[PDB]
């Protein structure tokens, strides 16, 4: 370009140096490392239900052949129990405020 190319180089070098300092400054480097591994664990080892069962059926745990139905039962029971608790709370509130209405 022109004489401003020196300013361009200075600015880009300053940005590079700041990035380098921030990345591998001991505490920041350690916390970025731990954050990267935590992100890997979260994304790749999420609580799935479908997975490759390479082991023979004589080796697969019964905890794995029934985990789907355990999860479905727990979620459905939680939902129906929440609905029942909402109905019970509604009737309880109505009865209580009818008793205290007088």
């Amino acid at each position: 370009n022109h004489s401003c190319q020196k300013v361009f180089e200075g600015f880009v070098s300053a940005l590079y140096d700041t990035s380098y300092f921030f990345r591998n400054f001991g505490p920041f480097k350690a916390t970025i490392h731990y954050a990267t591994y935590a992100n890997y664990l979260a994304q790749n080892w999420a609580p799935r239900v479908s997975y490759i069962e390479t082991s023979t059926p004589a080796y697969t745990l019964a905890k794995n052949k029934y985990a789907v139905y355990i999860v479905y039962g727990l979620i459905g029971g939680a939902l129906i129990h929440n609905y029942m608790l909402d109905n019970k709370a509604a009737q309880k509130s109505q009865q209580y405020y009818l008793k205290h209405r007088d």
Binding site: V49, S50, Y51, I52, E53, T54, N64, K65, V68
Partner: protein
Amino acid sequence: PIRNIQFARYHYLAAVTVFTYFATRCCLLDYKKYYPLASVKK
């Protein structure tokens, strides 16, 4: 030998449908445009 392949398919389809339902609001329209072309009661 994927376990619960049907469940995985159903879960992915349900997630996609729910996301498209909430992100686009396709099933929850606004009928203010249709209000002028309507006959009122009372």
